[PDB]
């Protein structure tokens, strides 16, 4: 049970600005089997080449301007609680 | 049970600006089997070449301007709670 | 049960601006089997070439301007809660 509220707020939220989220799972399985029964065999050169995984962010020029003008917040009643009674907010001028 | 509210707010939300979300799963399976029974065999050169996975973000020029003007927020009653009674907000001028 | 509300708000939401979402699943299966029974065989050159997967974002010039003018938010009653009673919001001038 989440209650979230924003009244006249400025937010500049940034999750992982440059690189971001990089998830690399390098899990090859190698079960290359050689069976020789009642015979003859030469040399075994087993040279399986490794993978190359590269993730690059070269030149990034990010510019963000965030402006907020509120004249006045004045007269706010904000009740996110429960079972509350008799909540009053008065404002008079002159 | 989520209750979200935004009254006169400015937001500049950015999730993974540069790189983003990169998920690489490099999991090849190699079961190349050689069976020799009651015979003869020469050399075995086993050279399976690795994969190449590259993800690149070269030159990125991102510019964001966010402006917000509110004259006045004034007279707000905001009740996201439950079972509340008798909530009043008065504003008079002159 | 989600309740979302936006009254006079400015939002500049961006999910993965540059790279985006890149999902590469490199999982080849290699079951090339050689069986020799009661015979003769020469050399075995097993050279399966690896794949090349490349994802590129070269030159990206993104520019976003977001302007918002609200004169006044004034007199708002916002009740997303349940079972609430007697919620009043008064505004008088002169």
């Amino acid at each position: 049970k989440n209650v979230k509220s924003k009244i006249g707020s400025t937010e500049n939220l940034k999750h992982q600005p440059g690189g971001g989220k990089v998830q690399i799972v390098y899990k090859p399985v190698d079960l290359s089997k050689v069976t020789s029964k009642c015979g003859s065999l030469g040399n075994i050169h087993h040279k399986p080449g490794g993978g190359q995984v590269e993730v690059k962010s070269e030149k990034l020029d990010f510019k963000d301007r965030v402006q907020s003008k509120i004249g006045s917040l004045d007269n706010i009643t904000h009740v996110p609680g429960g079972g509350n009674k008799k909540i009053e907010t008065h404002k008079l001028t002159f």
Side-chain angles (χ1 to χ4, degrees), chain A:
Chain A
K1 184 98 182 284
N2 296 332
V3 180
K4 286 176 181 178
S5 307
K6 283 160 193 183
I7 309 157
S9 70
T10 329
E11 279 156 69
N12 189 42
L13 262 86
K14 289 205 166 187
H15 296 272
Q16 304 92 38
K21 284 172 93 175
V22 187
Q23 284 188 47
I24 293 154
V25 187
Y26 190 97
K27 58 171 182 180
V29 201
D30 185 34
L31 313 100
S32 62
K33 55 198 278 178
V34 176
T35 69
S36 181
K37 291 256 186 177
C38 298
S40 63
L41 214 111
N43 295 314
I44 299 162
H45 297 151
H46 193 247
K47 281 185 188 171
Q52 286 158 70
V53 176
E54 63 169 312
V55 184
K56 279 186 180 182
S57 300
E58 192 73 28
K59 297 165 197 286
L60 319 180
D61 184 42
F62 280 78
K63 285 167 180 181
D64 284 59
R65 281 181 181 174
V66 194
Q67 276 195 336
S68 190
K69 270 258 187 180
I70 294 102
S72 48
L73 266 142
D74 294 308
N75 185 229
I76 314 286
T77 312
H78 177 251
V79 173
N84 294 310
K85 288 168 183 179
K86 309 153 190 178
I87 289 151
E88 47 199 315
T89 324
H90 299 90
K91 169 101 163 178
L92 326 183
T93 322
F94 287 78

